[PDB]
Symmetry: D2
Subunit: 115 residues, 4 copies
């Protein structure tokens, strides 16, 4: 699995469960063609987004639907979504975890890149 | 001043100086229209992007060009940029400060919204 | 002003107001001695803790009383407080800003150090 | 395993490997008696710190030796260590993960608490 997503909730100290995640890749014509998506699991994780064959170098965007998550808990949020835009770079063996930590008015994201 | 941006560098413990910042506003046809842009000052701040008149309700995207910054420091970062997308002014006019904290493989963003 | 503290609330998107802050300095016998204390203002800032004279080289601990803050908001947070421990002034006198970003189950802290 | 620690490196986008972690518990006489410790693994994790029998309600401190980590990479850091102080609360089934994300001049910590 070359690309995983992991989301945490800073208010509840828990995985952020049932969070919608969309991944896009920059296309020839500079358009963000949908690439993959899913909903975080009970552990706050989303695996199986893509395969190594499909996950070529390129610019990618991972959009995390944070606004719907906070609405489902009844907490007024600032952002429409959290967005993580990065270039995948095919330098030998590499797996990518995009982690996000959510609060109503803040978020952090980190990339954990391993061989 | 209703929209300010503040950038910090988590590696040097300093303001993130001369960082490019572009603001877009979502238009009628779900296209992102250029709204305002500038560069952070020596204090890592960017003021005077807009006016209370011009800064109507809408969905805004504040794109902070973090890759060019880290590059200029001789570091190949993970992200292309930090992007913060939010509805503004939807319960009336407010003053928004968008803060970002930058590392090569991570960033954090918070909004401070006042009367 | 060589030591300032800035607190933000990631849940309300506001400064974290009236937050208690205690500073200690490590003494000769590896005991923490009371150095200075105060509460954040309406802007979430705490200035005038010390003077350039009094603020000598040493190991300092800035304890931010985050539990009492979240309690006063009706939230039972994870942490007892945020604690930031650092050597100060060890390459000469500097100006230190300790920023913290608070959620119930998470916090972030950064130092901005200038001439 | 009732208490785990996980540390990430924001500069390198990697687990923070071989990082010293000490856990202390507040003692009768308000002293921080060493409770457990170890070094993060290749995955940035530390498990097996304590057992459910031993991990009673109480105030705990998890000290992460961030300064030695940054020194081993040759990057000047601000903090002496990252410290996470919290009360363990014995409310039914609960496991605690203390996650920390490190940069030279900043860190974030989060508690992920599951049943
Ligand atoms: O990944 C697993 O496996 C994992 C598994 C399990 C758990 C976790 C796991 N992973 C995981 C763990 C964690 Cl902890 C994570 O957490 C990362 C969190 C990083 C957050 C840091 C944000 C700090 C922002 C402070 C900015 C302050 O700026 C300001 C300043 Cl300095 C001054 C002023 N005032 C002024 C003064 C003067 C003039 C104008 C202003 C003016 O107003 O601008 C205003 C501002 Cl706003 C993540 Cl992402 C992933």
């Amino acid at each position: 699995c070359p690309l995983m997503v992991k989301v945490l909730d800073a208010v509840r100290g828990s995985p952020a469960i049932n969070v919608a995640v969309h991944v896009f890749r920059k296309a020839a014509d500079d358009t963000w063609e949908p690439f993959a998506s899913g909903k975080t699991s009970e552990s706050g994780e989303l695996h199986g987004l893509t395969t190594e064959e499909e996950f070529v170098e390129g610019i990618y965007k991972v959009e995390i639907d944070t606004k719907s998550y906070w609405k489902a808990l009844g907490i007024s949020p600032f952002h429409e979504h959290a967005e993580v835009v990065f270039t995948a770079n095919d330098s030998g063996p590499r797996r990518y975890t995009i982690a996000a930590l959510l609060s109503p008015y803040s978020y952090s994201t980190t990339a954990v890149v391993t061989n």
